[PDB]
Design a protein around this ligand. Structure first.
Ligand SMILES: Nc1ncnc2[nH]cnc12
Ligand SMILES: Nc1ncnc2[nH]cnc12
Ligand SMILES: [Mg+2]
Ligand SMILES: [Mg+2]
Lengths: 181, 181
C-alpha cells in the first residue's frame, strides 16, 4: 500500500516553488514520493517535460507523471485520477493543491467522486482561509511567491530568474530560446 | 564609480531567500554586484563563512563581505559602512533590507549619518508598509518566506530542507553535524 503525492500544474516553466511545494508536502506527510503532473496545453509539451525532468533529475523522491500529456484532449482531473487508480489499485493518492485553489474545488468536474478517489492536501498559504467543504487535510510549506507566469514575464522583460528556476532549466530555456517572445 | 549592494544577516545558515533577495535586488537595480555580509555572532563563524562561500560559489555577481567577522566586537552598521567607504571611496553602497526591517531604522546607531553614507534599498514585502522616514528606495522581489531560524528548527526536528537551502550547504551541514542539537 503505497502513498503517492500528485502536484498538478502547467509547469510553463517548472520553478523553485513547484519543487519546494512538492518536496515539503510529501516529506512532511511522510509520503513515499511525489509526482509533478503537467497538464495538457503555447510551447510544445516536449519542452515542458524536458525541463521538468531536468528539475527533478537528482532526487528519487520527485518524479514526473506524464499521463495527461499522453492522453491529451479533455483531461478532467477526475478522469485522470480514475485512470491512475485503476492502473495502481493499491496506491493511496494525495492530490496537492495550493491553499488559494481550495476555494474553487466546487468548479471541479465530479469533485464528489474525486474526493472519494483521492486524498486532497491543501498547502496552507497566507491570505487564503484554512476552511473549505470537502475533506481536505493541510500541510505547512514556506511561502514561495513564484509563478510560471511571473517567470515568463521576467524572461520577456529580460530580468534575472537565477535561483527562482533551477540552473539546468535556465540553461535549457536559453539553449532552446524559450519564452523570449 | 562602482555600485555595490550589501545584504546583511547572521546567515545561520545561508538559504535560498538570501540568494533570491541579493540576486534580484542587485539585478533589478542594475548594481555591479552584491555582497552578503555576515554579522559577528552559537556556531563558529568559520562554518557560517564556509557555507556562505559554497552558496555563492558559482556566481560572480554574489560575493561575501567578511569585514564584520574580522573586526568583531561592537559592529554597529554605521561603523562598518564607515570603514567600507573609506576603503572604497569611489563606491556607492546600496544597503539592502527587508521591508519588515525598514520600520526599526530609527533603532539604528547614527542612522542620520548612515543614510548620508549609503543608499538604503527596501525589499517590498506583503503585510509591511511601503512608507518610512529616511531616504529608502524600493525594489520588488518574489516573497520567499524562509528564515535561518526556520531552517535550524527544521534541522532540529529532522524535517527536509531540500531546495530551501543549496545542495552544497545541506551537504556541509550534514558533514559537520551542524544544527542537529
Ligand atoms: N498552476 C500552476 N501551474 C504551473 N505552474 C505554476 N506556477 C505557479 N502556478 C502554477
Ligand atoms: N536577518 C537574517 N539574518 C540571517 N539569516 C536570516 N534568515 C532570515 N532572516 C535572516
Ligand atoms: Mg498499486
Ligand atoms: Mg572605490
Amino acid at each position: 500500500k503505497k502513498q503517492v503525492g500528485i502536484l498538478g500544474g502547467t509547469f510553463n516553466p517548472v520553478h523553485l516553488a513547484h519543487l519546494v511545494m512538492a518536496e515539503q508536502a510529501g516529506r512532511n506527510l511522510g509520503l513515499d514520493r511525489v509526482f509533478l503532473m503537467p497538464s495538457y496545453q503555447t510551447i510544445d509539451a516536449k519542452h515542458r517535460l524536458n525541463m521538468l525532468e531536468l528539475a527533478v533529475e537528482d532526487n528519487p523522491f520527485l518524479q514526473i507523471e506524464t499521463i495527461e500529456l499522453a492522453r491529451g484532449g479533455k483531461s478532467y482531473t477526475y478522469d485522470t485520477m480514475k485512470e491512475l487508480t485503476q492502473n495502481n489499485p493499491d496506491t493511496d493518492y494525495y492530490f496537492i493543491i495550493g491553499g488559494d485553489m481550495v476555494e474553487y474545488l466546487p468548479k471541479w468536474y465530479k469533485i464528489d467522486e474525486l474526493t472519494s478517489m483521492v486524498n486532497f492536501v491543501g498547502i496552507r498559504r497566507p491570505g487564503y482561509t484554512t476552511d473549505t467543504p470537502y475533506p481536505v487535510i493541510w500541510v505547512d510549506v514556506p511561502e514561495i511567491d513564484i509563478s510560471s507566469t511571473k517567470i515568463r514575464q521576467k524572461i520577456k522583460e529580460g530580468c534575472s530568474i537565477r535561483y527562482l528556476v533551477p540552473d539546468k532549466v535556465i540553461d535549457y530555456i536559453q539553449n532552446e530560446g524559450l519564452y523570449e517572445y
